[PDB]
From a paper:
14-3-3 is ubiquitously expressed in mammals and plays multiple roles within the cell, including phosphorylation protection, conformational changes, subcellular trafficking, and induction or disruption of other PPIs.13,27−29 14-3-3 typically binds to a phosphorylated serine/threonine in intrinsically disordered regions of its clients. Of the 7 isoforms found in mammalian cells, 14-3-3σ is the only one that harbors a cysteine residue proximal to the client binding groove, providing an additional degree of isoform specificity. The disulfide tethering screen targeted C38, a native cysteine on 14-3-3σ located proximal to the natural product binding pocket within the phosphopeptide recognition groove. We explored the scope of disulfide tethering for the discovery of selective PPI stabilizers (molecular glues) using the hub protein 14-3-3σ.
Residue numbers in the entry:
A (entry chain B), B (entry chain B): 21 to 28
C (entry chain A), D (entry chain A): -4 to 231
Write the structure that this text describes.
Amino acid sequence: RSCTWPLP
Amino acid sequence: RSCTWPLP
Amino acid sequence: GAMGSMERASLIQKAKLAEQAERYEDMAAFMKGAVEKGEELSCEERNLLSVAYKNVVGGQRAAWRVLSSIEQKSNEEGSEEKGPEVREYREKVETELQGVCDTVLGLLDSHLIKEAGDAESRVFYLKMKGDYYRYLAEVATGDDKKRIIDSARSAYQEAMDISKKEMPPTNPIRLGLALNFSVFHYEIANSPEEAISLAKTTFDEAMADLHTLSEDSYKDSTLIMQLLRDNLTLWT
Amino acid sequence: GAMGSMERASLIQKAKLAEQAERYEDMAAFMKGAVEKGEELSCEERNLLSVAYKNVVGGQRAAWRVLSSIEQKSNEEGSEEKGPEVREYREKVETELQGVCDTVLGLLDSHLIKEAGDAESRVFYLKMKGDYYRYLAEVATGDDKKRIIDSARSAYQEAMDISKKEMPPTNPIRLGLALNFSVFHYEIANSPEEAISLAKTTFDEAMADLHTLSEDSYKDSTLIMQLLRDNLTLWT
Ligand SMILES: *SCCNC(=O)[C@H]1CCCN(C(=O)c2cc(Cl)cc(Cl)c2N)C1
Ligand SMILES: *SCCNC(=O)[C@H]1CCCN(C(=O)c2cc(Cl)cc(Cl)c2N)C1
Ligand SMILES: [Mg+2]
Ligand SMILES: [Mg+2]
Ligand SMILES: [Mg+2]
Ligand SMILES: [Mg+2]
């Protein structure tokens, strides 16, 4: 998928 | 650790 | 709520313990309790809040995607009728996800955003507002999908406008905001060109400002820049 | 309970969906609901029950170990006093773990074990009873620790006696029982020699019976045999 920030 | 079965 | 009797400092201490234990539901509950004390959050405390809810909603989103995929396959031609269970269970997970999003949005509206005067804090919270409307948008299908999408867009835009005025182009909050708004454009707004433009401009302006940074700040910024590059690679 | 209105078949269907979604709390709740319908469980359904609770308790046990480690360090000499929070939060996780164990034990006592006449089912449930008393033993410190340990031992022993009479030495349930009883001996009963003897005898008797098996049964049995070998390697 596309990367989004904080990251779980 | 020591292995036990089902494995989570 | 159920955290009303616990000291603010104890709630923050326990959130950190819950993180170490990978108990993110507990971590979120502790941080909600801390926010509800009514004091502003420090930088570290904002990060704890974000990590807690990101992990909780991240689990729900992953589960929702699994279930939606199964549901979509069930509604193909030649797929055997399996009754209402898949839809019911997808709906259950969806409703729980929406609840978490509404909880976060509630904390932001009552009253984190209005009390946030410094750029760092205000941009952080507006980015969160964008992000949780974006998660609501991912599962939205009804009369309100457009309004949910616009709510995300509006929050991200306000955050962007402040960040460009008040923060350097390498600021990690500014970078993460831009990264997530670019994903909003690509995945939610059906605007891949806007997504690509935003990611590229953000990357290039950050690159040009790296020379001003310490080694530690350079590490923080370049980590997020790599995520922008990763998306651009995926998208082009 | 809250699953009282849902069809047995729907509960099993949803447990499988929850597994695919990695939603183990939901999976456990669905399987509890299915058990509470009062019908015996099939082989596949017993496995769903076991997988669900193993994942839930596995998370709790991992968290408990993190927290207990932190608590133990806090009570060393030269460690700064940090107040009651670590103990409180360890206690919270502990109580939740104990609750899950009591729930599983409750299902076994009301009325899975008494209705289980075939060796496969009866050994499966008695192994579970041993396992959940063993998890209670891992966190026990009071007047009842010895009795908890004996409850585990008694369940495992009954299971062992039936398995040796009624199942071949390669049977995966027999193997997994022996593996777990060997761990009980090593970790809980302070009997490493018994643990080692049990693992060795079980491995050797299984080895000698592999020739009787199909390719698929051979795979099932040898997987568990490797776990016995892994423990023996760790212990000797
Ligand atoms: S809070 C005091 C120490 N750290 C910081 O101020 C920042 C520097 C380290 C990098 N940061 C982030 O990358 C970040 C960005 C976003 Cl958009 C959200 C989060 Cl939760 C973080 N941690 C924080
Ligand atoms: S249920 C019908 C198909 N499978 C089986 O009967 C067994 C064969 C596959 C191996 N099995 C196990 O290893 C096993 C052992 C124990 Cl002690 C617990 C569990 Cl949950 C399993 N799955 C099941
Ligand atoms: Mg819905
Ligand atoms: Mg622009
Ligand atoms: Mg206790
Ligand atoms: Mg013996």
